[PDB]
């Protein structure tokens, strides 16, 4: 029940602190805005090719994310594999259909979705899809 | 030569994300208290010993600590090779009295004194120092 404290804290934040592996072994840290899906207990986040975090990725998978909780100071962190989609390529295909159901669950409803699948293509986006293996930490209470 | 604009974000906070390298490669995160030299362009943290899979600080010091500004997303991130104290192993030893000025240099005078260098025996503290090597992320604008 203990897991459960530190996936409350992942659950009631949308924003977090990827890790990731550099061609070095060194750590690469940057905030990344995320839906947490307690169904499947993944964490969804959107990001760009080009970006380090993105390169980083294709050659090491393995990430973590640190969400603090509300007080600011207690916090949980979900480590994982990371599995990434292609990066959109095309308006109407599987990488920019993923993207658009994020894009619901974090904003809403998109105004010009045509728009929307324009700039995935454009921007390259890929859909970053981290399923939870272990959450350490320490939550409210512990803190 | 680092971003002042950077730099200014890690002198406005006092807590941020540290990343250290554990033994299968993995990053470790945490939220801690740090104190930023300015001058010497520093930041020092106090930490336990290390044990199991995090102790692999003690042959591979590579650590990352990334601060959030008072925007939306702005965040800098520091970059050094860690140097580290042997743990407190005595109320009076060279560490807990290093670990005394970091107190004070980041919260102030602290009430009993004897309660904090038994504290500090008692979590094995690690005075950890990380000279600024690299800084990188988002710089705030106009606000
Ligand atoms: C207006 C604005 C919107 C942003 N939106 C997202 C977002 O939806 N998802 C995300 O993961 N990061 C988002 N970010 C931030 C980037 O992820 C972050 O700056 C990035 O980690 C850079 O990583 P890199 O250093 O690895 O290239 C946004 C930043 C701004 C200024």
Same mark, same amino acid.
């Given at each position: 029940?203990? +897991?459960?404290?530190?996936? *409350? =804290?992942?659950? @009631?934040?949308?924003?977090?602190?990827?890790?990731?592996?550099?061609? %070095?072994?060194?750590?690469?840290?940057?905030?990344?805005?995320?839906?947490?899906?307690?169904?499947?207990?993944?964490?969804?986040?959107?990001?760009?090719?080009?970006?380090?975090?993105?390169?980083?990725?294709?050659?090491?998978?393995?990430?973590?994310?640190?969400?603090?909780?509300? +007080?600011?100071?207690?916090? *949980? =962190?979900?480590? @994982?594999?990371?599995?990434?989609?292609?990066?959109?390529?095309?308006? %109407?295909?599987?990488?920019?259909?993923?993207?658009?159901?994020?894009?619901?669950?974090?904003?809403?409803?998109?105004?010009?979705?045509?728009?929307?699948?324009?700039?995935?293509?454009?921007?390259?986006?890929?859909?970053?899809?981290?399923?939870?293996?272990?959450?350490?930490?320490?939550?409210?209470?512990?803190?």
């Amino acid at each position: 029940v203990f +897991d459960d404290k530190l996936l *409350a =804290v992942i659950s @009631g934040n949308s924003i977090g602190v990827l890790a990731t592996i550099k061609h %070095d072994g060194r750590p690469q840290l940057s905030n990344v805005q995320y839906h947490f899906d307690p169904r499947k207990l993944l964490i969804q986040v959107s990001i760009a090719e080009p970006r380090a975090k993105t390169r980083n990725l294709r050659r090491d998978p393995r990430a973590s994310i640190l969400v603090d909780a509300d +007080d600011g100071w207690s916090y *949980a =962190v979900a480590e @994982g594999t990371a599995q990434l989609t292609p990066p959109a390529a095309a308006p %109407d295909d599987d990488t920019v259909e993923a993207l658009i159901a994020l894009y619901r669950n974090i904003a809403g409803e998109h105004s010009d979705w045509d728009d929307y699948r324009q700039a995935m293509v454009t921007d390259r986006r890929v859909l970053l899809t981290l399923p939870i293996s272990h959450v350490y930490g320490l939550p409210p209470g512990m803190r």
